Symmetry: C6
Subunit: 171 residues, 6 copies
């Protein structure tokens, strides 16, 4: 059936235990120009609610890493602005204007409970962040037509959705 397509992809590679261990979860989402602003935030909030545990009870907080490609910087910063306005505080390695890429902010924001997720701007920020993370890194890709190139010593999943709307129910 139609609903069966979403039912296979949910636990084939994306399956989730009752308490997932705090590893460096990288979520690569393809942002094409046809996909509007609104449904990306519905995916990001679903990514943030599941694969981040920032409750005060635990001592091992973790947050997902978010990567977008195939988009212009105009709507990438436009999406970035509303996420911060809606109190979904993130870090992208640029703590101030005119900063060089500082992955040490991504180090502490992963363990910070007040920072919900982590944004990655481009390819060069993603590869430099990978060397900065020393703990286990798993990278999940949700693409439609274009696939990113990922270094081969990392556990990767590749999921080809119909469009961006099908990503959210998987995650």
């Amino acid at each position: 059936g139609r609903k069966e397509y979403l039912r296979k992809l949910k636990e084939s590679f994306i399956r989730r235990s009752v308490n997932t261990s705090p590893y460096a979860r990288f979520f690569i989402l393809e942002f094409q120009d046809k996909t509007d602003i609104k449904t990306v935030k519905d995916c990001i909030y679903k990514i943030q609610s599941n694969w981040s545990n920032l409750s005060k009870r635990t001592d091992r907080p973790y947050s997902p890493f978010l990567l977008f490609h195939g988009t212009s910087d105009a709507n990438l910063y436009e999406l970035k602005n509303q996420l911060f306005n809606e109190d979904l505080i993130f870090t992208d390695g640029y703590p101030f204007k005119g900063s060089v890429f500082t992955p040490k902010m991504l180090i502490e924001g992963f363990s910070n409970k007040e920072i919900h997720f982590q944004f990655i701007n481009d390819i060069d920020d993603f590869n430099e962040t990978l060397n900065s993370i020393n703990i286990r890194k798993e990278v999940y890709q949700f693409y439609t037509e274009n696939c990113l190139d990922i270094p081969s010593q990392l556990p990767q999943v590749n999921i080809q959705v119909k469009d961006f709307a099908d990503i959210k129910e998987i995650v």
Copy 2:
């Protein structure tokens, strides 16, 4: 079967998690002078009970925003007066008589455990409050004849119901 339409509207649009995050939830209901006040109150109490967590244990309380359209102000205030008489304390942006619409009264009332929900009198109060809540806002519409226009940067669902009685089992 006859319930088969109800399930398609329950779990596919207004699916509910047991630990839903404190979003600015907007509920738009069509009051159109043919449904009685009592059936609206049962829908309002059901909207209150499911989509507000005002327990003393939590640190992130939330309350749903309710807006009615298509009816006169006479039965809108009559519905409004019965809700306050039954100890369902709400706020509507008019803390006193002859007041200008005060959006911040709807703001601490979102985080107030003693304020059960928020009442929106008209579209003009709905649209200007939309610029007041900074956090993510979700709008849920339940309508029988006329669907209200919502600006396109919000996550909206539009559900067409047979009458006002079918809303409360959906929520």
Copy 3:
């Protein structure tokens, strides 16, 4: 099958949640002379055990309101004398002999953990206490041959049973 009508009667009108809010629940039962005194108490204890939360953990206690019609006053008091003997303490608005109807005793017994339910003698005490409880009141009717006239501004359900024996498995 034969148990099917019990499923058309249990979760379609008298569906029960585990965290039901403290509402003024009215239970109107048709007690006829054919019905034995003993089998009514099995319904009263089932109604009291399900629709009352008098535990010391909560701060919002509630008790059901019970109405009986279609019976003589002699056997109604005979039932009333039994329930007080078995430590099922109730109030009827008559705290002493020769008293007028005091609905205030029914208000305090609703919020009292040591008072298990509330008795209503006839129609006139039902309508007088109807204007006394300010919070939302729901009326549930279980009857075989005579239907009461409940005012239309209250949420009412009407259920037909063959006799009084099937009411307790409904609730």
Copy 4:
């Protein structure tokens, strides 16, 4: 199936809730001098484990009442002696040798955490017991060929079993 006769007697007559209220529960088992003591002790321990709540958490303890009939006192006392030897402390209204029947021991033993159940020697002790507990009393009769007479003012169930061995998995 062969099991289906046990299923129609499990959930239709002796259905059990996890939070059963402290009622004066009377269990009548028929002793017919051909069942050995061991299966009777297996039935009593199943009755005691399920229908008594003597934990330190609760503030409303309750213990079942045990009645046997149709047998001589030779095996009735001999069964009674083993149950006290296995630290299953009970009361029977005879706290000392040559005592008259004292039902007050069974009322205190009903609410005592250190008294597991209550023994009833005969139908004359049972009727005198019946007028002593004021709270609601239900009688469960499990028998093979002889049925005792219970007053019609009490909620009673009657279960006919193939032999004494089917009683323990009903309770």
Copy 5:
């Protein structure tokens, strides 16, 4: 199939509740010459892990009683020495060398959290212990050719297995 034979003797004879009461459970196993000691230790550890509850929270600890027959004393002590080497602390009524059987040592070890189970050397130690435990005792027999003689007043089950390795899934 073949696994239906495991189901017919698992849930029908050695069915287990999560809150089993502290009874003096006896497990009688046929140790033949064909059985290796390694398989027996898997069965003994499974007997401990299910039918002993020695947590620090409970106030009623219990431990099973272990009996073996049909084997020589050479491999009985060799099995006995391996169990003590793997920190499975037990007692057998012989607290020192050259001791007479001491049934009281099997008594506190029933209630001792640091004593995991009780070993019984032969027939004469089993019957002598049977007169020492006052509380209810249940005896479970698993054997392949020879069935041990058991006193009739003791509640017992008799289970016929293909070999010793099938015992551990049943218990």
Copy 6:
């Protein structure tokens, strides 16, 4: 179907309880030359997450023992050097450079909450640490083409896998 062989391999040998006791669990894995370094780490992390309970709540911590073979030391140390980089702290009985095998470091790391698992370099270190752990030891083998010889006094399972990828969903 295809996942049938996975179900025939999962709960029939490597069945897991939620309260598994602290056993000296040995995991022997076939690291042949065709296996990538990365896909072994997914099995090591799955073995560590399931068969180790290093939480601060318990007082009996346990860690799995890992053995690898079928390849040279070039990729065995390269796999070993990565696991220490990702904060998966282990011990192998070689606490310093040029050390003799110290099985005592494996015993303390078994009970150490900050040591996640234990590495075994070869069979010579496996047999030496075999005589060091006094408690019950279980050995689990997962292999494709070579099966090693384990002494027959230990509980062993042998599982043939198509390649190293299916081992992780088995455990």
